[PDB]
């Protein structure tokens, strides 16, 4: 309860950590920790009745977020870990179920069968791109095939529990918490041409309420980088 990092404080009360490992450290690298280890809270999305899902690219969403956006442009390489706090606040009269996954290397596929999706359609800088429950038409310029039941990666959406995940069931639970290490083939990689993670939120059992209750449940995603180190003189 009331954990603080740097000059920011959140409030909690179960945490699932990575693939079993805690994030730790390793020309020579420099290790900054004061101006990066803090809670960057993204703005809140609205979960309505006919919602489909959201996704963020993780070393892209904090690209304009304070001094962490300055270390992405001034330094060439770098490696980070993450600590993702998801919490949605609903009353006892609402119902639903979310699935919160953190997929490493989520290569997505274009709607046009010959091209690859362009840069603005894969990742929004601290703004969630959204799923659909239909198909996206092929004859357009360039967009992501974002049918939710195939998760945009050509794979059955029920089997997405093999990646490190956590359930948010509004009957019993309220929040999720993930701690993710650095998973890449090279020990230190570029932070502009590569997104090594992907945070997905998919409503399996959709929201329901009676007439009179508030028709939306806001979700709040709070990310804090752990054990970051860069490469420079």
């Amino acid at each position, epitope marked *: 309860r009331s954990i603080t990092l740097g000059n920011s404080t959140i409030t909690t009360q179960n945490v699932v950590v990575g693939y079993g490992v805690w994030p730790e450290y390793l020309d020579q690298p420099t290790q900054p920790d004061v101006a990066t280890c803090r809670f960057y809270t993204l703005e809140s999305v609205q979960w309505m009745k006919n919602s489909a899902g959201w996704w963020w690219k993780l070393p892209d969403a904090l690209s304009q977020m304070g001094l962490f956006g300055q270390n992405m442009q001034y330094h060439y390489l770098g490696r980070t870990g993450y600590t993702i706090h998801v919490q949605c606040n609903a009353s006892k009269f609402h119902q639903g179920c979310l699935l919160v996954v953190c997929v490493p290397e989520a290569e997505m596929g274009c709607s046009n069968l010959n091209n690859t999706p362009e*840069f*603005s359609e894969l990742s929004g800088g601290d703004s969630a791109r959204m799923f*659909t*429950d*239909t*198909q996206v*038409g092929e004859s*357009n310029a360039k967009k992501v095939q974002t049918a939710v039941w195939n998760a945009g990666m050509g794979v059955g959406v029920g089997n997405l529990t093999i990646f490190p995940h956590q359930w948010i069931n509004l009957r019993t639970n309220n929040s999720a918490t993930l701690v993710m290490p650095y998973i890449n083939s090279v020990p230190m990689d570029n932070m502009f041409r590569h997104n090594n993670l992907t945070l997905m939120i998919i409503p399996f059992v959709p929201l329901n309420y009676s007439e009179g209750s508030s028709p939306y449940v806001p979700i709040t995603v709070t990310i804090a980088p752990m054990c970051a180190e860069y490469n420079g003189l």
Partner: antibody
Framework: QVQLKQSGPGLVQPSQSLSITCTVS????????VHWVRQSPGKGLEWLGV???????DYNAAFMSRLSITKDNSKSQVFFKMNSLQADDTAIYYC?????????????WGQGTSVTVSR | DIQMTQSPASLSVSVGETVTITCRAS??????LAWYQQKQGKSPQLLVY???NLADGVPSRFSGSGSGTQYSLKINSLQSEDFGSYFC?????????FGAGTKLELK
């Protein structure tokens, strides 16, 4: 939250150029695309063209050579231009933003500037 | 491209009936459909998108159903503010083509 609005020339001579500017408010052009819809009393509604959020455009087939839609992310404005302006273009022109929850539908529309092409 | 044939062209009802407006596509669009309502001399408003889902502030009287090439919209109980023009649009592929249009007189 307040949304987009436009300002146009009002009326043109035949075989002249038309240029309307739709200026937005409260959202960015890096997250949405803007469609251009023409409401006609004779042929009904028709979709003229669109500029996507990446900068790519896609125009109608019948109005391909005459149209050109461009935008600027910084000053938050979209310019479109139609040329040679025959007699059938007596209509009202709307600008409306797309990507309503990622479904490519029109969220909210401009006020519309009706044009008259005759002398 | 693909044409949307909307039927009927006009209707004349009172307050409180069940009406049904259908529009049929030339080929399959995979539920990529939007429904609009335009009043007298104003900008049209989004009513039902993706052929089932309701809009943000649209009341729960409206309903859309259909899949494939056949779609429909229903109002269970009319009110005084529910007449005007209604159009259907596919957003499956460019070029997007609107429907013909229907009118409610509320006699």
């Amino acid at each position: 939250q307040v949304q987009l609005k436009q300002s146009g020339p009002g009326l043109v001579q035949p075989s002249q150029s038309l240029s309307i500017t739709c200026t937005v408010s409260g959202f960015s052009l890096t997250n949405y695309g803007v469609h251009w819809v023409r409401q006609s009393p004779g042929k009904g509604l028709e979709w003229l063209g669109v500029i996507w959020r990446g900068g790519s455009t896609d125009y109608n087939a019948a109005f391909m050579s005459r149209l050109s839609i461009t935008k600027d992310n910084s000053k938050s404005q979209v310019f479109f231009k139609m040329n040679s302006l025959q007699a059938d273009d007596t209509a009202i022109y709307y600008c409306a933003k797309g990507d309503y929850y990622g479904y490519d539908a029109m969220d909210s529309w401009g006020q519309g500037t009706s044009v008259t092409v005759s002398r | 491209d693909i044409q949307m044939t909307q039927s009927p062209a006009s209707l004349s009802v009172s307050v409180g009936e069940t009406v049904t407006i259908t529009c049929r596509a030339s080929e399959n669009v995979y539920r990529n459909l939007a429904w609009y309502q335009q009043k007298q001399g104003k900008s049209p408003q989004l009513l039902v998108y993706a052929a089932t889902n309701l809009a943000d502030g649209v009341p729960s009287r409206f309903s859309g159903s259909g899949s494939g090439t056949q779609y429909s919209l229903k109002i269970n109980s009319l009110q005084s503010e529910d007449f005007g023009s209604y159009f259907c649009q596919h957003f499956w592929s460019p070029v997007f083509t609107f429907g013909a249009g229907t009118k409610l007189e509320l006699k």
